Design a protein around this ligand. Sequence first.
Ligand SMILES: Nc1ccn([C@@H]2O[C@H](COP(=O)(O)OP(=O)(O)OP(=O)(O)O)[C@@H](O)[C@H]2O)c(=O)n1
Ligand SMILES: Nc1ccn([C@@H]2O[C@H](COP(=O)(O)OP(=O)(O)OP(=O)(O)O)[C@@H](O)[C@H]2O)c(=O)n1
Ligand SMILES: Nc1ccn([C@@H]2O[C@H](COP(=O)(O)OP(=O)(O)OP(=O)(O)O)[C@@H](O)[C@H]2O)c(=O)n1
Ligand SMILES: Nc1ccn([C@@H]2O[C@H](COP(=O)(O)OP(=O)(O)OP(=O)(O)O)[C@@H](O)[C@H]2O)c(=O)n1
Lengths: 535, 535, 534
Amino acid sequence: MTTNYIFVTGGVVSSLGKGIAAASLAAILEARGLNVTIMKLDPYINVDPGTMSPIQHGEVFVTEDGAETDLDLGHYERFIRTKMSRRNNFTTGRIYSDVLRKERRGDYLGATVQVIPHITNAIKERVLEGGEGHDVVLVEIGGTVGDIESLPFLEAIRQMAVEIGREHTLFMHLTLVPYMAASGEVKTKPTQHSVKELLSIGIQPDILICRSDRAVPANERAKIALFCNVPEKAVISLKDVDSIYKIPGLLKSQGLDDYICKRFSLNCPEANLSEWEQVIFEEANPVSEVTIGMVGKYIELPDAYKSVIEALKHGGLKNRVSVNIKLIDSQDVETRGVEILKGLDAILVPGGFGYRGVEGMITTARFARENNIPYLGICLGMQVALIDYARHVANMENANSTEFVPDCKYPVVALITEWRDENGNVEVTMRLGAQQCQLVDDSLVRQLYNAPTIVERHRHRYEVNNMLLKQIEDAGLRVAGRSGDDQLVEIIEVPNHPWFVACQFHPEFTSTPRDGHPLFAGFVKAASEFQKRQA
Amino acid sequence: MTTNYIFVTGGVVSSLGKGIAAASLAAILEARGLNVTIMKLDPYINVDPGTMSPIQHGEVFVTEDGAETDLDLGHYERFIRTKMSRRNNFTTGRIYSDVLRKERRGDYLGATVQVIPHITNAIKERVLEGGEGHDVVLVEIGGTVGDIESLPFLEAIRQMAVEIGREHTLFMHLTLVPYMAASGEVKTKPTQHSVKELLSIGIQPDILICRSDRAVPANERAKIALFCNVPEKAVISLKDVDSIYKIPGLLKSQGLDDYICKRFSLNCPEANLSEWEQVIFEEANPVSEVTIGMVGKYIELPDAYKSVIEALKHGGLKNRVSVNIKLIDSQDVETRGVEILKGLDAILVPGGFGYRGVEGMITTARFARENNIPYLGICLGMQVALIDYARHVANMENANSTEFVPDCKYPVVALITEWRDENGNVEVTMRLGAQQCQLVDDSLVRQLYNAPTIVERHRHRYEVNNMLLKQIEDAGLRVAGRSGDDQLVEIIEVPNHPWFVACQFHPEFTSTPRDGHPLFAGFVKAASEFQKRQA
Amino acid sequence: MTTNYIFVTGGVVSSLGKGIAAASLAAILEARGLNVTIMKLDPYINVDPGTMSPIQHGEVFVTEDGAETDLDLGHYERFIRTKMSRRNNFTTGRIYSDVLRKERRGDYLGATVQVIPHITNAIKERVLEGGEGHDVVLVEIGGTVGDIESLPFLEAIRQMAVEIGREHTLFMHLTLVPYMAASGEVKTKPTQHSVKELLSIGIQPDILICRSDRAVPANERAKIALFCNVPEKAVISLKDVDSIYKIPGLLKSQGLDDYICKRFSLNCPEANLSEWEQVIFEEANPVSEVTIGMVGKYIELPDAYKSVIEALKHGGLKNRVSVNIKLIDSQDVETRGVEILKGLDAILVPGGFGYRGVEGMITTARFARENNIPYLGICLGMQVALIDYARHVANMENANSTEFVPDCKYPVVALITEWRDENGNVEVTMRLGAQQCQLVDDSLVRQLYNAPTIVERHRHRYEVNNMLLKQIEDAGLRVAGRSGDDQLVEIIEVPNHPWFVACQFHPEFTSTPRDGHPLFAGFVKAASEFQKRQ
Ligand SMILES: Nc1ccn([C@@H]2O[C@H](COP(=O)(O)OP(=O)(O)OP(=O)(O)O)[C@@H](O)[C@H]2O)c(=O)n1
Ligand SMILES: Nc1ccn([C@@H]2O[C@H](COP(=O)(O)OP(=O)(O)OP(=O)(O)O)[C@@H](O)[C@H]2O)c(=O)n1
Ligand SMILES: Nc1ccn([C@@H]2O[C@H](COP(=O)(O)OP(=O)(O)OP(=O)(O)O)[C@@H](O)[C@H]2O)c(=O)n1
Ligand SMILES: Nc1ccn([C@@H]2O[C@H](COP(=O)(O)OP(=O)(O)OP(=O)(O)O)[C@@H](O)[C@H]2O)c(=O)n1
């Protein structure tokens, strides 16, 4: 059929939750049997989030094909079944980098390359590439309407609406309707000025999503409906909610999907939100609760562990366990000591880069292993576990990673190019994306995944030194998973411990609220068993 | 002292002559003993005009250091003594290319690169680099105020005005004051809306340069003065003129330089425009007139030969000769024949690339040589002269250039890598910028330049094949100039002809109206001698 | 029958000619059998042009019902048959005067009166009032888009477009496309910025009228067409012309009327512009030429005599005569003398108010009566003719009007309440609009009109003193027209003269290029015969 497009923009302020709204609406349309997809347009000059620090942009989400993207794609995969790829997230820097490469190559035939139409042509080509092949395509424009940085994005999508037509395009505008105490009522004036910004660039909104700390009354929605020349049913109230999994139900309660299916002339059955109602049911009726400590180095911005924090909540839904996540600075463990790690039913060390705070994570891993506290290490959290076991069990003095101490005697973690031993003898590139992993029989993860092979996503450089691995294995450490040709260690386990698993890949990128994740489900389940054993 | 900046912008329309106004004002300030310089900001995505076709952007001006720049720098060097370089002209594509390279290198330290401040910081760094070291710096912003493409340029210079202060910065805004027949008066309303555009981005004009097909009356300047909150003496009338060399006198007659020197607290004597009054004197009182035919391939846009056409007028000033330049399509010579080249006192073949129309230039060179018509070839015009002489005198059948016929038997013009002969035997990279050339004694150019060595600017790839040169020399052709180590032929001359000179470099880039050029002066002088010999 | 609306605005500059383009477009639709009407929305604070000076704003047009309106209603009546009224022109001052009246009256029930919606509703009420009853209604908005003085007008008609819908509303935008000599081409950038201003206030154009000193090439129109997201048929080129009577044909040749009939779903035959083609042919092929001097006091602004100058040209179309109008300051006749009136085939003294320059008009009328030069006096031009005849034929020393000399012995012109005589004895207030007039048999105007009664429009206060009239009638003067019950003198004629007529009404408000006017046709015809005799 004909591909339909829903352009999503926001005004007044920036942190309106544009991606959450687009993902929630896409879950409704998908629930009606429609083939839906989402993409994100960022107005940054960075070519991709690969260079951005975690404390600035958030987590670096990794798709299946190995693309480093904005974390909004994690929201997309946690709401709809469609798998994101590189074509679902591009930036202004990517556009200019592509146009500049075509010009120097001479593909513009000596013409003068301009913002209009050449930059806008490059944007339309990418929006079409990621969209064509689906029924409805949701395009989220980053930034606030009225700023310089998103003007090429808005002018580009305006040309698509003209060329495609109003029977297959919709402009959905999020706006802020703030409440004033001195007025006792929410205020529509910021929406008035924001919609006037869209008109001055040739965009007429079709749907207004009103964001506020409370429901926007029907009287105030009527003023917005008349000022914007849209039907009253096209003005939706989106109040602040405690759980984002309720937002799909809120939009359907106001007929947002019925208005979109009508405008696009799509004949599809009513949405069946039973799976989202079940997710809300499990979250609202827990049996017990636990406290899991997440010891990392980017705690100053909790969004640096977005998918990890969300996957922990998913492990609680499947076990009916309420999870209280306690962010603990690993550098505080370096100075104040282990005393800060008391009162935890489980310990998780997420990934990261840089030596700052690593020794605090190595001390944290030793504390969880010796005191039989359920432990889950991811990427860097696996390295600090291998370093702890090699030092304090295998008696490898000052064993470390070449990333932190290049001239160490026992480089248990190093690049494949650097593999050596304690004598210096040798043998005779960022890994990104999904890769198959072979699980070892009689291992804990072989039972959790209930499969001989699995597929997880990577983002790391330094690997386990296979030259020093067999000595650590003789000390009791277990290898639970290998991958590829070089038999690189992917998962390690410590027997004689209630639950101690560490993996090289990032399992949080495959966890969803409706399906959970086998690793996090067993990790949270072991946390409640540890808590109950403290009668 | 402290560097002062004059930002030059334009509104209403694009073809206001912003560069002509900035260059004319810089000639006045320089005439007062001030160290002045100019720079041009282009909002194109091209990294430099090196890829733009001549029929689209105009001529590709070449500075001394070898930079391919916008032709507005030709206006700069023809008005002030300061020599332009690469730092006097950059584009939006250059800015983004520099910022993108810094990001991938990691110089931004994992931060999020944004339009503000990172793109605006990159613009301010370049404006300061080309300016610091001078008293007054004129910064011309391309495009029309109110468009998307020049918004980063305007926001960047607005931050410089705040940081530097209003005692060392001035905003000069060119505007259109059109005349309406039904109103019998010029209209100030387009200026009203244009100045409102500047206010909405944080810029208040200090000087209004009113462009119109007639002088803007003092009554209409008063309305503009009040609407813009500027003194009446800051509203200048710039009517359409027959000669751009009169514009320096028009601006000084209205005290534009006195207002700038006062605002900047510069104590300097009154401008002495005697050299510009002398240039206007020579142009207005010619003795005879001639008609010179310029046979090229980019005639559809006369700006493709901007500096060449201007240097021909400079040769007439020094000889008191009025020059009627007749643009003749070389491709018309291919089909209609030589009959179109009748009635010319001189023939000039300028540079170019591509085989289209080259055979018409080869026929044109043969016509000028056989009929004793003064001929001047530049770059490509020199190649077609060498091809003509090798074919029709040296009897080298189908002699050509490898740029046009790669497998020709006599590649008299080819890359140094391709140098071969008629038997195929061999011997045992764009040239850009100024290079020294050694003139041969008893040659025509040795007397015109009156020097053993000269310096001219290059822009070409294909050179004279030194393997086939000595056979052409035996046929009568003369080598007048060589350069560098490889003794590459720079100038050729045909004896037994009143005036026949062809050079590889572009001499039009060094010609000015106040100083002329020795080559063009002798070329135009020989044209009037040919015209007089037709009694 | 659903009434359609065509909103007409303009940008870049003010002097685009919005009214002429609206009247020309209305002439095409009317030529197809449609009932059309035009409106004018002025953003001035003046309640009506009655207070505005002639030398500053132009002529004060008078409709049939007696309304003092902008002169653009003169262009309207000269292009379509529909008669204008008070409902076809209102200003911002009128809107605020209405709203303030309803407020103190208590019609707003103690509510807070605001610009939106109260001021905008008052505008929409008046646009509907003048529009309903027709097929197509053209509403011209004064001012330039982007200025603040016309923002309520633009928001009001924007609300009407939503209520009515795009099936019965159109936005036609006039814009300037200037030519640059340094570029050798016209520039569309001002149109870009002006259209963006329209979008900022919620208006999207449907038709673009490109004004320039030359035809806008099809390449530049296609660039404007896609920038505004309109079909290339909706971008019309309207170059500068030598005669406004060519504009209806120029718009039809580009299919502007067909696009409007299509958008409004109207099925009507092709426009028949045979009358306008005849007007263009007559103007382009004159046989002889005359020079008619217009001696007045408002020559400082030519627009002060807009309909008079236009009616003189219509008198030349009916006679195939090229009329070369020469504006002469009557105050110059006072100082330089009669020598200024030399070399004129006819003399016209228009109307006005104030004693300044009147004595020069009295001298001018005497020069035409004594030298047998065709003369036409309108309103004040009739007073100076009566004053001249009373002084130099009836021997009434210093005969004058009480408007100028209140205590003159012979007040031949005075208010009806002031009527006295030379001894002081007495007998036992604006006139505006159309009033029937009775013509006297065996008179000149009786023949020209070919009717016993006529209807013309008035604008004056001072009448002919009927107490002193019989003495002037005995001296030779003849009364050719009377009106009403008081038998007020409307037309006077001087016998033993080739062509000497003076009337109190304003006949120029009835003249059209297609029908002319009996008075002006005979006036210019007399000038041609006078020119042949010299
Ligand atoms: N006139 C402007 C001003 C700023 N920017 C952009 O605005 C972005 C900042 O967005 P935001 O997250 O809202 O940060 P703040 O401007 O600080 O807004 P707030 O204080 O509400 O957080 C920057 O990327 C900058 O490029 C822009 O495009 N146009
Ligand atoms: N484009 C507009 C629209 C509205 N108004 C004015 O704005 C005023 C409304 O004041 P306000 O108290 O802000 O009304 P609301 O728009 O309803 O404010 P809010 O809903 O945010 O409480 C009205 O008098 C109206 O004249 C205006 O001048 N410009
Ligand atoms: N920001 C402004 C400034 C002016 N005006 C209005 O614009 C009108 C002026 O009309 P115009 O004939 O265009 O005057 P000028 O500005 O002098 O036009 P121009 O000089 O171009 O001939 C005035 O009535 C004034 O109320 C306005 O509404 N908005
Ligand atoms: N809203 C817009 C529209 C266009 N552009 C820029 O405007 C430039 C075109 O400039 P100009 O030389 O004036 O061409 P035209 O738009 O065609 O203007 P005109 O018709 O007057 O020649 C293009 O580079 C384009 O990037 C822009 O920045 N903002």
